[PDB]
A paper describes a structure:
Beta2-glycoprotein I (β2GPI) is the major target for autoimmune antibodies associated with antiphospholipid syndrome (APS), an autoimmune disease characterized clinically by thrombosis and recurrent pregnancy loss. The binding sites for anionic phospholipids, lipoprotein receptors (including ApoER2) and GPIb are in domain V of β2GPI (β2GPI-DV). Circular β2GPI can be converted to an extended form by altering pH and salt concentrations, binding to a high-affinity antibody directed to domain I or by the binding to cardiolipin. β2GPI, which is abundant in plasma (about 170 µg/ml or 4 µM), acquires its prothrombotic properties only in the presence of anti-β2GPI antibodies. Anti-β2GPI antibodies create multivalent β2GPI/anti-β2GPI complexes that have pathological properties compared to pathologically inactive β2GPI monomers, which are normally present in plasma.
Residue numbers in the entry: 243 to 327
């Protein structure tokens, strides 16, 4: 079974490449599909990835994920921050 987009906007890693999930999966994800979302470590100010997989028509987004806000122009999206070591 197939999953609907779990979020509105996010850059994720799909098969090694960064894509906008809303663009690359504009028509849903297929079973087995796997992406990595980006989350922030706000103490070390670096980003880390958390994988999420479409399993029987459901894809659970990691709890640390935060949706992009166009209004928050002073905030850096997790994907744009230096990666955690």
């Amino acid at each position: 079974g197939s999953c609907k987009l779990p979020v509105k906007k996010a850059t994720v890693v799909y098969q090694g490449e960064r894509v906008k999930i809303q663009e690359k999966f504009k028509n849903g994800m297929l079973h087995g599909d796997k992406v990595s979302f980006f989350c922030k470590n706000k103490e070390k100010k670096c980003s880390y990835t958390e994988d999420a997989q479409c399993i029987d028509g459901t894809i659970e987004v990691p709890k640390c994920f935060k949706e992009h806000s166009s209004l928050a122009f002073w905030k850096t999206d997790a994907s744009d921050v230096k990666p955690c070591a």
